[PDB]
């Protein structure tokens, strides 16, 4: 005689990133093995009734994380790498100028004058030489 | 005699990224193995009644993550890489200018003058030489 | 005698990205293996009654993630890569200018003057030489 | 004697991306293996009654993710890559100018003057040389 | 004696992208294997009663994801690639100009003057040379 009663009430299970081998990153450079590994986990969750007898569940399991990293020649030369710019502003708030007078002679008013040339990146590669064999 | 009763009430199961080997990233450079791994997990979830006997579930499992990384020649030369620009603004809020007078002589008013030349990227590659064999 | 009762109530199962090997990324560069892996997972979910006997479920499973990365020659030279621009604005809000007078002589008013030349990308490739064998 | 009762109530199952090997990404560069993997998962979901006996379900399964990456020669030279532009605006809101007077002589008013030359991309490839064998 | 009762109530099953190997992406460059993998999954869903005995379901399954990537020669030279433009506007809202007077002499009013030359793409390929063997 075997009786199994299962009455869960509002089982709320949330799983965002369980065993996902996800590579979410910016690679601006290079010559690099990114996320060479895998995901071989067993996030077991048990909540109900169980009953087992005279069995053979698992045996001779083999999960070797064998990584062979043998880069022979790798060259990264004369490189200019820039990743991010964030919130680069130039503000002139409430710029008030009053030039009053009588029988005067205004000559030159330049409220701005070449205030900025470059803001984020001015990457230059001038007369750069590289030799190999 | 075997009896199995199963009465779940509102089982809310949410699964966003369980075992998805997802490569979601920007690769501005190169010569790099991106997301070479896989996903071989077993996110087991059990909530109901179970009953087993005299069985042979699993055996001789083999999950070796064997990665062979052998890049022979890799060259990244004379490179200018830029990834992101975010919120690059130049603001002139409430610019008030009053030029009053009587029998005067205004000559030159330049409220702006070549304020910016470049903002994000001015990538130049001038007279760059590379030699190989 | 075997009895199995199954009365689930409002089973809400949501699955967005379970085991999908999805490559969702921007590759502006190159010469890189993107998302070389696969998805071989078993996200098992059990909620009902189970009953098994004298069986042979799985055996001799082989899931080796064997990745062979052997790039012989890879060249990335004289490259100018730019990925993103976001919200690049130049604003002139509430620009008020009053030029009053009597028997005066206005000569030159230039409220703008070549304020910007380039904004996002000015990628130049001038007199760049590359030699190979 | 075997009895199986199955009375689910409002089973709402939602599945957006289960095991779809979907490559959804922009490849502006090149010479790169994009989404070389597959999808061979078993997202098993069980909710009803089960009853099995004296069977042979699975055996001798072989799911090796064997990827052979052997690019011999790959060249990416003298390249100018740009991906995205977003919300590039130049605004002049509420530009009010009053030029009053009596017996005056206005000469030149230029409220705009070549404010921008290029906005997103000015990709130039001038006198670029490449030699191979 | 075998009895099977099946009375589901409002089974709402939604499946958007289950196991579809769909390649939905823009390839502006080239020389790249896009979505070389397949979809060989088994998203099994069970909700009804089951009863089996003395069977042989599956055996000797072989699902190797064997990908052979052997590009011999690949050249991408002197390329200018641009992907997207989004919301590139130039606005002049509420531009009010009052030029009043008595016995005056207006000479030149140019409310606009060659404000923009190019907006999105000015891809130039001038005097670019390439040699091969």
Swiss-Prot record, chains A, B, C, D, E:
Name assigned to this protein: Major prion protein
Function (record text): Its primary physiological function is unclear. May play a role in neuronal development and synaptic plasticity. May be required for neuronal myelin sheath maintenance. May promote myelin homeostasis through acting as an agonist for ADGRG6 receptor. May play a role in iron uptake and iron homeostasis. Soluble oligomers are toxic to cultured neuroblastoma cells and induce apoptosis (in vitro). Association with GPC1 (via its heparan sulfate chains) targets PRNP to lipid rafts. Also provides Cu(2+) or Zn(2+) for the ascorbate-mediated GPC1 deaminase degradation of its heparan sulfate side chains.
Q: Which Gene Ontology molecular function entries are recorded, alphabetically?
A: amyloid-beta binding; aspartic-type endopeptidase inhibitor activity; ATP-dependent protein binding; copper ion binding; cupric ion binding; cuprous ion binding; glycosaminoglycan binding; identical protein binding
- Residues annotated as glycosylated: 87, 103
| Tissue specificity statement from the Swiss-Prot or TrEMBL entry | Highly expressed in the brain, lung, kidney and heart. Expressed at low levels in the liver and spleen.
Q: Which domain of life is it from?
A: Eukaryota
Mod. after translation: N-glycosylated.
* Annotated organism of origin: Mus musculus
Q: Which GO terms describe its cellular component?
A: cell surface; cytosol; dendrite; endoplasmic reticulum; Golgi apparatus; inclusion body; membrane; membrane raft
Q: Does the keyword Protein biosynthesis apply?
A: no
This protein's assembly is summarised as: Monomer and homodimer. Has a tendency to aggregate into amyloid fibrils containing a cross-beta spine, formed by a steric zipper of superposed beta-strands. Soluble oligomers may represent an intermediate stage on the path to fibril formation. Copper binding may promote oligomerization. Interacts with GRB2, APP, ERI3/PRNPIP and SYN1. Mislocalized cytosolically exposed PrP interacts with MGRN1; this interaction alters MGRN1 subcellular location and causes lysosomal enlargement. Interacts with APP. Interacts with KIAA1191. Interacts with ADGRG6.
Q: Where is this region: Interaction with GRB2, ERI3 and SYN1?
A: 1-133
């Amino acid at each position: 005689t075997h009786n199994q009663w299962n009455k869960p009430s509002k089982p709320k299970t949330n799983l965002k990133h369980v065993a996902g081998a996800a590579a979410a990153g910016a690679v601006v450079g290079g010559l690099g093995g990114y996320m060479l590994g895998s995901a071989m986990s067993r996030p077991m969750i048990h909540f109900g009734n169980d009953w087992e007898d005279r069995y053979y569940r698992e045996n001779m399991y083999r999960y070797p994380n064998q990584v062979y990293y043998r880069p022979v020649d790798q060259y990264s030369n004369q490189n200019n790498f820039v990743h991010d710019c964030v919130n680069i502003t130039i503000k002139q708030h409430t710029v008030t100028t009053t030039t009053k007078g009588e029988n005067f002679t205004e000559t030159d008013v330049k409220m701005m004058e070449r205030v900025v040339e470059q803001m984020c990146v001015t990457q230059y590669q001038k007369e750069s030489q590289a030799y190999y064999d």
